[PDB]
Amino acid sequence: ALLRILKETEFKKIKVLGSGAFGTVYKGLWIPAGEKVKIPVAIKELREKANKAILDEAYVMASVDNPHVCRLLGICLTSTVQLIMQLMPFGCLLDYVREHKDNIGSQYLLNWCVQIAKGMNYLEDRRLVHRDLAARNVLVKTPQHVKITDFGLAKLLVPIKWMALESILHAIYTHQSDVWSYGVTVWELMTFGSKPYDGIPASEISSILEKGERLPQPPICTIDVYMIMRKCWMIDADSRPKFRELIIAFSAMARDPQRYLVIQLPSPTDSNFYRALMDEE
Amino acid sequence: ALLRILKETEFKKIKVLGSGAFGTVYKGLWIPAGEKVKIPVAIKELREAKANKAILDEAYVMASVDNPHVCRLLGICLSTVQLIMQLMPFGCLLDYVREHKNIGSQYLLNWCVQIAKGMNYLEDRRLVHRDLAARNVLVKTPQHVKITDFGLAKLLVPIKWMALESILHAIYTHQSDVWSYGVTVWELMTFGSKPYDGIPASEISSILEKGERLPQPPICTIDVYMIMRKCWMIDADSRPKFRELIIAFSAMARDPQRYLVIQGDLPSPTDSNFYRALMDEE
Numbered sequence: 001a002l003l004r005i006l007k008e009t010e011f012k013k014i015k016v017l018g019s020g021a022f023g024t025v026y027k028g029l030w031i032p033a034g035e036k037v038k039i040p041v042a043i044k045e046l047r048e049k050a051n052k053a054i055l056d057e058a059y060v061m062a063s064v065d066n067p068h069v070c071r072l073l074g075i076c077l078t079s080t081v082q083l084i085m086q087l088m089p090f091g092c093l094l095d096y097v098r099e100h101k102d103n104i105g106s107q108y109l110l111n112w113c114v115q116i117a118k119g120m121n122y123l124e125d126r127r128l129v130h131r132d133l134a135a136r137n138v139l140v141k142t143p144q145h146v147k148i149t150d151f152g153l154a155k156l157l158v159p160i161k162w163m164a165l166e167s168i169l170h171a172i173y174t175h176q177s178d179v180w181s182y183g184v185t186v187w188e189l190m191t192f193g194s195k196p197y198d199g200i201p202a203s204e205i206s207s208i209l210e211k212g213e214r215l216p217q218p219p220i221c222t223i224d225v226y227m228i229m230r231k232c233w234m235i236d237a238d239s240r241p242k243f244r245e246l247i248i249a250f251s252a253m254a255r256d257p258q259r260y261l262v263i264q265l266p267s268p269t270d271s272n273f274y275r276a277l278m279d280e281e
Numbered sequence: 282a283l284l285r286i287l288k289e290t291e292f293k294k295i296k297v298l299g300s301g302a303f304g305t306v307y308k309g310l311w312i313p314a315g316e317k318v319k320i321p322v323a324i325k326e327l328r329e330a331k332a333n334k335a336i337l338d339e340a341y342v343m344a345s346v347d348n349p350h351v352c353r354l355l356g357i358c359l360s361t362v363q364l365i366m367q368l369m370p371f372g373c374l375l376d377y378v379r380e381h382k383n384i385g386s387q388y389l390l391n392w393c394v395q396i397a398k399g400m401n402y403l404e405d406r407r408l409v410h411r412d413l414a415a416r417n418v419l420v421k422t423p424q425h426v427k428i429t430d431f432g433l434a435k436l437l438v439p440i441k442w443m444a445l446e447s448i449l450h451a452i453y454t455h456q457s458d459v460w461s462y463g464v465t466v467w468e469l470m471t472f473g474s475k476p477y478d479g480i481p482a483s484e485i486s487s488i489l490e491k492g493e494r495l496p497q498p499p500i501c502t503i504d505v506y507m508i509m510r511k512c513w514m515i516d517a518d519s520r521p522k523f524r525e526l527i528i529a530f531s532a533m534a535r536d537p538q539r540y541l542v543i544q545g546d547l548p549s550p551t552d553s554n555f556y557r558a559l560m561d562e563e
């Protein structure tokens with residue numbers, strides 16, 4: 001009821017928007033049968049499991065209801081699998097911070113951390129494990145609104161530099177390892193999209209973590225934010241913070257952003273403009 | 282606070298969509314400052330009429346409406362007055378009914394209900410549309426319609442839509458909006474027929490005085506036609522109030538096949554949820 005199965009004849013891929021490990025992303029047009037309208041959408045043709053299993057996980061993916069979690073809207077099952085969701089012209093968060101390296105404000109970064117924590121806490125409440133949280137898997141509806149996508153794709157279909165030690169060593173994935181990946185994502189945002197452990201071979205990461213080394217303190221970060229990152233990267237999974245707690249912490253910091261980030265928001269009207277044209281959510 | 286004043290630099294007209302009385306409509310792009318994104322928008326360049334503040338003050342009123350069945354003006358640019366609003370791919374209801382001449386009684390009755398709701402809202406905010414008509418009703422989804430362009434007439438002639446008092450003394454009230462509502466219902470029930478086809482507008486006042494009105498639509502039972510006829514009474518105070526129209530049509534919509542007769546006379550929860558997730562999160 002929440003997942004619309006689509007025929008091939010009712011939609012069309014128009015241009016390629018990007019790619020990821022799980023597949024290719026297109027701008028498409030949905031033509032509602034019996035109408036003459038073209039409605040833009042985002043289509044992910046997954047790369048190369050029984051059909052009943054694919055469909056069951058697509059239902060799970062389509063049952064989420066949270067302002068910061070993307071919901072799968074439609075699926076097309078043929079020789080390939082095509083996922084359909086709302087088209088968001090702003091793209092993914094990693095690309096955006098890289099494009100706005102010299103103008104992003106501290107309010108946005110703290111608010112993005114808050115929103116990602118809300119999405120993650122929601123998924124934990126639904127007993128869902130993302131397995132690949134990262135700045136590239138967070139989409140921008142509006143500069144003030146971000147949404148996590150693609151949870152569960154990893155299990156159905158390896159980002160070593162984002163994974164917890166337990167995941168690299170014993171292929172264990174939990175909400176706590178998602179917290180580790182959250183720490184890495186916050187690090188990505190605070191560095192304006194820097195590559196974690198740039199130039200370091202992935203095969204050394206297990207070693208570097210075992211001797212106690214972690215990603216460096218980001219230049220714009222006071223010790224307050226970096227401590228949260230470090231707690232997300234504790235070897236003992238049960239000692240890392242809970243998403244529910246990170247929301248509060250980052251929200252407090254958002255109440256006074258200039259004190260917690262040191263770098264060299266929309267007016268009420270612009271926000272309603274943005275919301276009326278693209279975010280009635 | 283509710284009206285964004287725009288600068289010619291933030292947007293662009295890209296395609297012409299149509300013309301009407303108050304102006305020409307284009308599909309356009311808002312390029313938010315600082316960004317590289319082009320966001321689809323709807324622009325209406327208005328025809329000349331009032332100083333710019335007067336315009337803006339009426340634009341502020343037009344921008345303060347908050348009702349699911351009333352279009353809200355979002356932005357304005359003031360060489361030409363350009364109004365901006367969200368782009369709605371389905372266009373106006375009149376063209377929709379003409380293109381699907383394939384429509385069941387439930388859709389028709391629900392459109393009447395939603396239009397009356399929007400009108401009753403405008404009456405509550407003490408605004409008089411002055412040009413209610415199928416052409417001024419836009420379709421967000423086939424299940425969701427919205428009145429637009431209220432107030433645009435005063436700020437800047439649909440004779441076949443106006444009450445006798447409006448034709449004779451340029452008197453406009455909520456009760457004359459009730460008249461135009463009746464004519465709008467007639468357009469919908471006839472699948473977009475042109476009211477008083479063939480009768481010169483100059484003679485409309487005469488035929489109305491002699492007691493002649495629009496004919497009963499073939500698909501209409503006497504109940505619906507009686508509602509229309511009551512909307513076209515000479516005594517303004519005897520016509521129905523929008524809040525009463527919302528009830529009767531609502532009731533009729535609860536048993537649609539008893540009040541409209543369509544040969545071969547409904548969206549699934551799945552498809553409804555889809556439309557809403559792509560185009561109507563309201």
Ligand SMILES: CSc1nc(-c2cccc(NC(=O)c3c(F)cccc3F)c2)c(-c2ccnc(NC(C)=O)c2)[nH]1
Pocket residue numbers: 017018019020025026042043044061062070071072073083084085086087088089090091092136137139149150151152153
């Ligand atoms: C990683 S990169 C990326 N993937 C997508 C995409 C597209 C279609 C479907 C899903 N994913 C799902 O449906 C989905 C899933 F697979 C599991 C759980 C929940 C879900 F919702 C992702 C986008 C994207 C999306 C919208 N708009 C834009 N706009 C621009 C300009 O890029 C880009 N980007």
Ligand SMILES: CSc1nc(-c2cccc(NC(=O)c3c(F)cccc3F)c2)c(-c2ccnc(NC(C)=O)c2)[nH]1
Pocket residue numbers: 298300301302306323324325343352353354355364365366367368369370371372373416417419429430431432433
């Ligand atoms: C003559 S018909 C018509 N006019 C408009 C239009 C465009 C921009 C602004 C306003 N109106 C206002 O700003 C406004 C006002 F002037 C007074 C009170 C409240 C208001 F909101 C109307 C459309 C339209 C709109 C969106 N999408 C589509 N899509 C397609 C395919 O046409 C068509 N159609």
